């Protein structure tokens, strides 16, 4: 469970 990055 990570923190949402600025891209995908």
């Amino acid at each position, epitope marked *: 469970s990570t*923190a*949402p990055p600025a891209h995908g």
Partner: antibody
Amino acid sequence: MEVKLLQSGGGLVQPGGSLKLSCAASGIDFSGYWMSWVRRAPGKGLEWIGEITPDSSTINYAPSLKDEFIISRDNAKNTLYLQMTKVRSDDTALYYCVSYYEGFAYWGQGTLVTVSA
Amino acid sequence: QAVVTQESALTTSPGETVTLTCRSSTGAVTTSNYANWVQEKPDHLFTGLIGRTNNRVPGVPARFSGSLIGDKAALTITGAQTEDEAIYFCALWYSNHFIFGSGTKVTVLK
């Protein structure tokens, strides 16, 4: 705890020198955050240096600066490292460490690097 | 590689609505560019506003909107306040790297 990113890095270096900046996190599970390095030049605007995943499996760099900067992290120490090798005059800038949360969420205070012989 | 372009500057009044654009030289700005909007207030104070085109950083007021207008990515400040007076940098993701824009000096008349 409140999120704080505390940078520690050199100041003055001469052309051809090397420096290693550190960014210690306190207030977040650093092990589950993407990290990134950006910089702000005196005249220029923001410039993206690079980013690194929580497990360090994928490290992305700006194509222009792939050979000058080396991004790493130690999740045990909750620390992010940027290594600048063989610098140039145009590297004089404020270097910032950013943590992603849907965007450029949490920032450090910035470290000044002055390159001059 | 690519050049990201946004307005040099904009001037607005408190309570009004302003819209900044972000242009890609490769073509139209799609959602696969994951537009990011970051603000720099005086004394080099950086704050993340928008990422992934539409997603606000948790804690950012809702007057900051991220959208796509035609070919470009867009940041909309609806009912701007004097504290929104800052330089707004746009950033576009090109598969493996971000490219930042020149910045837009937005002015809210104090």
